[PDB]
Design a protein around this ligand. Structure first.
Ligand SMILES: [K+]
Ligand SMILES: [K+]
Ligand SMILES: [K+]
Ligand SMILES: [Mg+2]
Ligand SMILES: [Mg+2]
Ligand SMILES: [Mg+2]
Ligand SMILES: [Mg+2]
Ligand SMILES: [Mg+2]
Ligand SMILES: [Mg+2]
Ligand SMILES: [Mg+2]
Ligand SMILES: [Mg+2]
Ligand SMILES: [Mg+2]
Ligand SMILES: [Mg+2]
Ligand SMILES: [Mg+2]
Ligand SMILES: [Mg+2]
Ligand SMILES: [Mg+2]
Ligand SMILES: [Mg+2]
Ligand SMILES: [Mg+2]
Ligand SMILES: [Mg+2]
Ligand SMILES: [Mg+2]
Ligand SMILES: [Mg+2]
Ligand SMILES: [Mg+2]
Ligand SMILES: [Mg+2]
Ligand SMILES: [Mg+2]
Ligand SMILES: [Mg+2]
Ligand SMILES: [Mg+2]
Ligand SMILES: [Mg+2]
Ligand SMILES: [Mg+2]
Ligand SMILES: [Mg+2]
Ligand SMILES: [Mg+2]
Ligand SMILES: [Mg+2]
Ligand SMILES: [Mg+2]
Ligand SMILES: [Mg+2]
Ligand SMILES: [Mg+2]
Ligand SMILES: [Mg+2]
Ligand SMILES: [Mg+2]
Ligand SMILES: [Mg+2]
Ligand SMILES: [Mg+2]
Ligand SMILES: [Mg+2]
Ligand SMILES: [Mg+2]
Lengths: 220, 178
RNA sequence: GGCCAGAACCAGCCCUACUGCAUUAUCCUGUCGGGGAUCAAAAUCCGGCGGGCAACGAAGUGCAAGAAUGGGUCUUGG
RNA sequence: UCGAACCACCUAGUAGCUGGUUCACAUCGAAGUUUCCCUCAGGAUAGCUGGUGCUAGUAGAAGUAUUGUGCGGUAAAGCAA
RNA sequence: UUAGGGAUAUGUGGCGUCAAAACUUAUGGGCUCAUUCUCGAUACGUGAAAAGGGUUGGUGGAUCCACCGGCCCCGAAAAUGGAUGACGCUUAAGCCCAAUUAGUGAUUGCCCAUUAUUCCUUUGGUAAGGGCGGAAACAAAGGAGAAAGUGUAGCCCUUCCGAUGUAGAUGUGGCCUGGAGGUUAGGACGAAGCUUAUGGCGUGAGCCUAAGAUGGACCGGCCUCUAGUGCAGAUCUUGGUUGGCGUA
RNA sequence: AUCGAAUCGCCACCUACAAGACUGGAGCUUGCUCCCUCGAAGGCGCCAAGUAUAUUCAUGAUCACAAGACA
RNA sequence: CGACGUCGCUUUUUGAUCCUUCGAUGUCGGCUCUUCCUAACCUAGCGCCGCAGAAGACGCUAAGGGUUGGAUUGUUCACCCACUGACAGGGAACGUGAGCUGGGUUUAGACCGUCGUGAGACAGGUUGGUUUUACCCUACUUAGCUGGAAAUUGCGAGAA
């Protein structure tokens, strides 16, 4: 929440709404480690990145094997005083954040700034839905990274069985979002068709040598 | 990729002396990375077979045997290798390639993969091109059917190096970062 | 102006592009035979006989001496 | 203050043992091995190092080859010697 | 294998992030799935035997049987929570081979040293050379210098080579302190002493200037001589101070 | 109101979804044939509100943060 | 169950060594209190016996929870009397002395036996024999005040 001083300064200066350049990444069907490595390098290079749908990441192997790995991680604990010991997060977004954090120099101010430049969500929240098209990382997608014969796990199920408590809520929110977006996209089809028709018709009205140039460069 | 071994013919003899005014002349086929290695293998074979050492011998010729035109062929390779546990083991294998050097390089890679045998523990006995009706293994024989055809599945196609990108729009070819 | 910058030229140095000579035969190409397969063929393969330069930027091969004369030097001095 | 009191002096008693030992650059640069010692936590002695040179500055050179000519009883081999 | 600095190129080791390099290279070939010290990536070295069995190879024999190899699995049990360095990796970022932009055209993919090559500067030589009879001419309103020399603010110039180091040896027109014989200066228009975001010089020991809104009467340089002549620590000596602490 | 600042693509056509061992549609002969919009392009934006013989730019004097920024 | 052989594991036994500590790291046992391991005594599930039933044996997963009261002895160990579902084995500087206790071992007093000419000796027996200091840092237990997202700044702007 902004302070009254900041609001007063903004009113005095008389400026418009400002949004920094932010890249939104849809992490569905992505390999956890490779995605984390790419994101960490980009953060160190100085980008602002927001990742969505963290509950649909993939890890190679079997769900039982990865759950056992997580339980082995959970065993680690400072015996003398556990309140000071390692803190084990169960949400998929927190899992991804920790994985990225392990690939950064987290004990320097540069590393902390890079880490704070990252925001992670489960599903797609309303404040991110309408901000523009999302991107993918081609060199970290399952259908080009895993051989299809081998089994794989989905991070959401593993988190749900090791202690995450909001899988059903996330599923219901995702279903509602998809239904709403589908209705909106079913609308405006007439507008899209009208624009396509107008572009098709403009060729007969534009000058002929311009038509020839477009044909020569393949945009006809 | 072109094969990493070349086909060398080495012709040599023992230096003449009073005891042996007219020594015998020997010819040797080898597959080596270069002619220095070829000469080394030739002298090793001469020492272990005819009791003639490189310090008392002459090399009359060391040339490269050119390959024939590229045609899909069946190659039979008779090869052998040494290991401490089992002594010497000799085997005969069949490959499909376009040249003798390619077949021998494939055989070396196969031996390294399936038996952990390195270059200097391997001796090549023979290599030849054989007809289709003389092939004994089905894994090789399946490739000369008259109506062979198959699709390409589970492909990983990478873009041209100048056009590769890091972040790309979801259902779009537009690049976002590089 | 004994300050800060840009460009030009000179000497030196550094890194580029531009390349000829030897070799090829277990090879190249026709024809006859058998051999294979087919639905009939061809092709992979083996003998003879006649010609040869695989020469497109031939070849993953053995040497190379191509600046009469392209850029860098806040890495050197004018 | 006692398995030999206290005070002053010989007395700054002796210690092969423990501790210390005050400015800067420059040219060079080791040894824990030999022999003797009531010698084994110490010395003397040769070796390794520094300084000073003398002598006609290529000399009487060499942790290396080649050729010629001597020496040897380990590795291996043998028990049918 | 090491004087003070640039540029270029390498060694050992590496090229998923941490972390520079294949923004995860190829238009290279095979093998491997590992459920609570959680496969593997451990040169030296810092875990594993006898004996046994999922896939992929090889010798023989029949008309399907024995044999023996690769990778994997069982055999394999300890004391704080933990270690291929961490995360992670399985169309590997694992193991065995093999390349350099790829059957297209012949020769060095890339990254990192107190090493190699080259350039600038210093210092010392078993150092190597040249010059040193002032050529001539020239007032303000082209300039200076030019020493027969171990060592300096080096007599001047050119050239080549070496440069780390405990115990230890030696050298220095090398630094600093109290006093003596000489010589040359300074001071009430302010000596010694003391203070410093006072700069300048020297590789350095140190030297010199500035300011004092400090002080109030002595003292600097150079050549020789001389010694009770240089401090961070000795459960060091003497004096003062100090956290514990407004605490027990 | 100090405040001078670094940042230099925007859209009410991307801003919905799923699958890479099967993507436009059929046919049997199951890898070939035929048909179609021909199966590797989000839309704009880069100096006349649009492709035409219209129109002010200096002396800010040869580089210098871009002396300008609500596209 | 398993001879004759043969391969391994462990550091809860004793040896072997002499790397650290001699201008000092308080040393046996018990009491108190916490935590860890599994080579599993009881409690939960399974499998198999030469398992008719009952009572048992030999295995596998499993360390979550339990594992006692007394006589003699300084004891650890041992043995006996009882109760019980059972009375398992170990580590933590042979856990734990500025936490206690001081019975043992190991000063100076004294007696006995054996040894010695003697002063004296004996991992032989016996009796008597000072247990010091926290108010410092950290750890732990409770108890108060208070800034801060560029984690104190930029005006550097991201709403589940
Ligand atoms: K914890
Ligand atoms: K024929
Ligand atoms: K022991
Ligand atoms: Mg013919
Ligand atoms: Mg008394
Ligand atoms: Mg004395
Ligand atoms: Mg005395
Ligand atoms: Mg002594
Ligand atoms: Mg001493
Ligand atoms: Mg030296
Ligand atoms: Mg004597
Ligand atoms: Mg001593
Ligand atoms: Mg012998
Ligand atoms: Mg013999
Ligand atoms: Mg005998
Ligand atoms: Mg890390
Ligand atoms: Mg990098
Ligand atoms: Mg096998
Ligand atoms: Mg690990
Ligand atoms: Mg491991
Ligand atoms: Mg590592
Ligand atoms: Mg020099
Ligand atoms: Mg030195
Ligand atoms: Mg005096
Ligand atoms: Mg000060
Ligand atoms: Mg003195
Ligand atoms: Mg002092
Ligand atoms: Mg500006
Ligand atoms: Mg001691
Ligand atoms: Mg001590
Ligand atoms: Mg203590
Ligand atoms: Mg003590
Ligand atoms: Mg113990
Ligand atoms: Mg005590
Ligand atoms: Mg204690
Ligand atoms: Mg007692
Ligand atoms: Mg007696
Ligand atoms: Mg007693
Ligand atoms: Mg702030
Ligand atoms: Mg702000």
């Amino acid at each position: 929440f902004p302070s009254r001083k900041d609001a007063f300064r903004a009113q005095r200066k008389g400026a418009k709404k400002h949004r920094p350049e932010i890249i939104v990444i849809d992490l569905k069907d992505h390999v956890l480690g490779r995605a984390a490595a790419v994101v960490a390098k980009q953060l160190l290079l100085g980008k602002k990145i927001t990742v969505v749908r963290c509950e649909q990441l993939n890890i190679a192997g079997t769900e039982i094997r990865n759950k056992i790995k997580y339980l082995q991680y959970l065993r680690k604990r400072k015996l003398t005083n556990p309140t000071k010991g390692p803190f084990h997060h169960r949400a998929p977004s927190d899992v991804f954040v920790r994985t990225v954090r392990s690939m950064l120099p987290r004990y320097t101010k540069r590393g902390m700034k890079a880490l704070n430049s990252l925001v992670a969500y489960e599903g797609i929240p309303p404040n991110v839905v309408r901000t523009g098209g999302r991107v993918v990382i081609p060199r970290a997608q399952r259908h080009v990274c895993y051989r299809s014969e081998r089994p794989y796990t989905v991070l959401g199920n593993m988190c749900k069985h090791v202690g995450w408590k909001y899988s059903d809520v996330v599923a219901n929110l995702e279903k509602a979002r998809v239904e709403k977006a589908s209705r909106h996209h079913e609308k405006q089809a007439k507008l899209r068709d009208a624009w396509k028709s107008a572009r098709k018709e403009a060729l007969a009205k534009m000058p002929k040598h311009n038509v020839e140039v477009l044909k020569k460069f393949g945009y006809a | 990729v072109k094969p990493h071994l070349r086909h060398y013919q080495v012709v040599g003899r023992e230096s003449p002396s009073e005891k042996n005014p007219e020594p015998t002349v020997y010819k040797f086929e080898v597959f080596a990375p270069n002619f220095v290695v070829a000469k080394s293998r030739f002298w090793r074979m001469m020492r272990v077979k005819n009791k003639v050492k490189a310090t008392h011998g002459d090399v009359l010729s060391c040339k490269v045997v050119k390959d024939a035109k590229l045609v899909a062929r069946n190659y039979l390779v008779d090869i052998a290798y040494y290991s401490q546990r089992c002594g010497y083991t000799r085997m005969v294998k069949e490959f499909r390639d376009v040249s003798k050097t390619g077949a021998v390089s494939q055989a070396y890679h196969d031996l390294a993969s399936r038996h952990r045998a390195r270059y200097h523990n391997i001796e090549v006995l023979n290599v030849k091109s054989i007809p289709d009706h003389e092939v004994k293994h089905l894994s090789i024989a399946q490739y000369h059917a008259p109506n062979l055809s198959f699709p390409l599945l589970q492909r990983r196609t990478k873009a041209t190096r100048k056009d590769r990108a890091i972040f790309v729009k979801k259902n779009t070819k537009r690049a976002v970062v590089a």
